[PDB]
């Protein structure tokens, strides 16, 4: 028996005992006992960066960015010493603006600010979305080399004092989440993100789950948040049952990768070989809300299972698949291979084309059956992933066609554990 991450409530799985592992969950780290206390210590003592109250002297405005609903940062706890330490400063709270970085997501309604932010917090100081579809609402800063040109929000770009908060986790095209991605795509225009997101990048064998040095993505939204700046940042990492395992504050770029060396020695998960059936989650709420963001957990299994093999994924989906533009992708190309020729031999560039192209890279190595109450299975059936009525039902499926010596791996964390094949074990 295993509880699967799955919506707010978990799904409670049986899986057979003569042929599962050991489930993949990450390392026991100890949470902090007082997380508002520690980002308080970690605002008078920063990583490469004078302390924040002394950054803040002087400065007429401000804008802290923050995650939308599909990252479980919990906000508050970074927030209210932060938004102290402003008023400390001087700066009234008609000058702080909190922005949330939706990237090229959908806005935050109303009752999602309350739930990021606590109602005191939506309640009294300005909370304005990112719109990266509309261009006149963002400023050029400049094109890197490879060509990108970076479009950033003017309310960020305008504001004398920028800092942004979130959290660090495994990320399919960035290798981890956190720092320098709350500018880059997290305010960046479409004009923007549809290149760094481009097959060009997308295609290369670093830009995946773990790897910072070497993948290009990484490379590049670094560049991109540098041209914008950022005076300040607050990132933490959250275990298992999301209690916060480690703040990191100060300098952008210094802060950020003392957040990675922790979380890289908690977040790894091994097995001795390959599997051919891997059962896996979307991290549950509020990851698992739409089939775009699960496709998540299909390449985060990819490391792990066999090629040819099954990748099982129980996920809520309690707000369906995703965007109209996503949603359209599957009407205009029935195939994955269809798709595929349309963006690799053209310049074509539709908003979240990317997560299709995600999606495509997992059908390449794995077949996919797809456990969820929040989407029909005549309706997933057209998304390129077998929709199956139970995961116990899956795997037993699974288990018939690869044989009496096939093993089960499972991850009931989903994409928050990153998983590897270590022969030495
Ligand atoms: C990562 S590539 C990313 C992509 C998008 C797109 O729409 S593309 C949006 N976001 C959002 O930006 C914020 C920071 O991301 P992080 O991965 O949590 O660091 C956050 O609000 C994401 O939802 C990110
Ligand atoms: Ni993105």
Redesign the pocket.
């Given at each position: 028996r295993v509880t699967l991450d799955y919506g707010k409530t978990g799904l409670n799985v049986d899986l057979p005992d003569d042929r599962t592992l050991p489930p993949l969950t990450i390392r026991p780290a100890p949470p902090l006992d007082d997380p508002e206390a520690e980002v308080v210590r970690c605002l008078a003592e920063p990583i490469g960066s004078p302390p924040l109250l002394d950054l803040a002297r002087g400065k007429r405005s401000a804008c802290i960015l923050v995650?939308?609903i599909?990252?479980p940062v919990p906000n508050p706890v970074l927030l209210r010493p932060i938004l102290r330490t402003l008023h400390a400063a001087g700066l009234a709270t008609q000058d702080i603006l909190i922005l949330?970085?939706?990237?090229?997501?959908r806005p935050s309604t109303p009752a999602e600010k309350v739930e990021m932010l606590s109602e005191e917090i939506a309640r009294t100081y300005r909370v304005e979305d990112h719109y990266?579809t509309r261009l006149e609402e963002h400023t050029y800063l400049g094109t890197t080399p490879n060509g990108v040109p970076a479009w950033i929000d003017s309310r960020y770009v305008q504001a004398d004092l920028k800092i942004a908060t979130?959290?660090i986790?495994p990320?399919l095209?960035?290798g981890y989440?956190?720092?320098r991605?709350?500018i880059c795509?997290?305010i960046a225009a479409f004009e923007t993100?549809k290149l760094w997101?481009g097959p060009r990048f997308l295609e290369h064998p670093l830009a995946d789950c773990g790897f910072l040095e070497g993948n290009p993505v990484h490379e590049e939204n670094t560049r991109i948040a540098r041209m914008a700046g950022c005076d300040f940042i607050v990132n933490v990492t959250l275990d298992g049952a999301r209690r916060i395992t480690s703040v990191v504050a100060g300098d952008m770029e210094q802060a950020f990768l003392k957040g990675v060396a922790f979380v890289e020695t908690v977040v790894k998960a091994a097995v001795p070989a390959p599997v051919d059936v891997v059962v896996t989650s979307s991290a549950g709420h509020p990851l698992d809300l739409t089939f775009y963001q699960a496709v998540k957990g299909l390449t985060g299994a990819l490391p792990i299972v066999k090629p040819g093999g099954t990748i099982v994924i129980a996920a809520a989906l309690a707000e369906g698949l995703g965007s109209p533009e996503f949603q359209s992708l599957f009407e205009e190309h029935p195939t994955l291979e269809g798709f595929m020729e349309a963006i690799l031999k053209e310049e074509s560039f539709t908003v979240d084309q990317?997560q299709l192209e995600e999606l495509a890279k997992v059908r390449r190595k794995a077949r996919v059956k797809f456990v969820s109450d929040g989407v029909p299975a005549a309706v997933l059936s057209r998304c390129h992933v077998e929709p199956v009525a139970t995961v116990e039902l899956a795997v037993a499926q699974a288990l018939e066609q690869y044989g009496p010596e096939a093993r089960v791996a499972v991850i009931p964390k989903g994409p928050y554990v990153l998983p590897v094949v270590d022969p030495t074990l």
């Open positions: 995650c939308d599909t990252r949330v970085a939706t990237g090229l997501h990266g979130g959290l986790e990320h095209m960035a989440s956190g720092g991605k709350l795509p997290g993100v997101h990317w």
